[PDB]
Amino acid sequence: FVNQHLCGSHLVEALYLVCGERGFFYTPKA
Amino acid sequence: FVNQHLCGSHLVEALYLVCGERGFFYTPKA
Amino acid sequence: GIVEQCCASVCSLYQLENYCN
Amino acid sequence: GIVEQCCASVCSLYQLENYCN
Numbered sequence: 001f002v003n004q005h006l007c008g009s010h011l012v013e014a015l016y017l018v019c020g021e022r023g024f025f026y027t028p029k030a
Numbered sequence: 031f032v033n034q035h036l037c038g039s040h041l042v043e044a045l046y047l048v049c050g051e052r053g054f055f056y057t058p059k060a
Numbered sequence: 061g062i063v064e065q066c067c068a069s070v071c072s073l074y075q076l077e078n079y080c081n
Numbered sequence: 082g083i084v085e086q087c088c089a090s091v092c093s094l095y096q097l098e099n100y101c102n
Contacts, residue, residue, distance in 0.1 A: 060061030
């Protein structure tokens with residue numbers, strides 16, 4: 001489900017699901 | 031809308047809305 | 061951590077903004 | 082950045098896992 005265009009809240013949701021208990025960092029103006 | 035219990039995807043959604051273009055870091059086992 | 065402060069207990073805008081970049 | 086690689090262009094599991102902690 002990750003091999004598509006993922007924007008805005010949909011990208012954050014994918015990070016949440018993939019990274020699990022690790023957590024993640026979301027830096028859009030990088 | 032932030033002064034409540036925010037768990038799982040609902041917490042990540044709140045961070046997304048509050049932090050905006052800054053982005054955020056989500057570290058649950060901290 | 062954020063889960064203890066915002067999920068197990070009531071969150072706040074102060075707490076959330078601590079996790080913005 | 083992640084928006085250029087996963088929103089403006091097609092994402093991948095490799096890219097996403099680069100942003101896990």
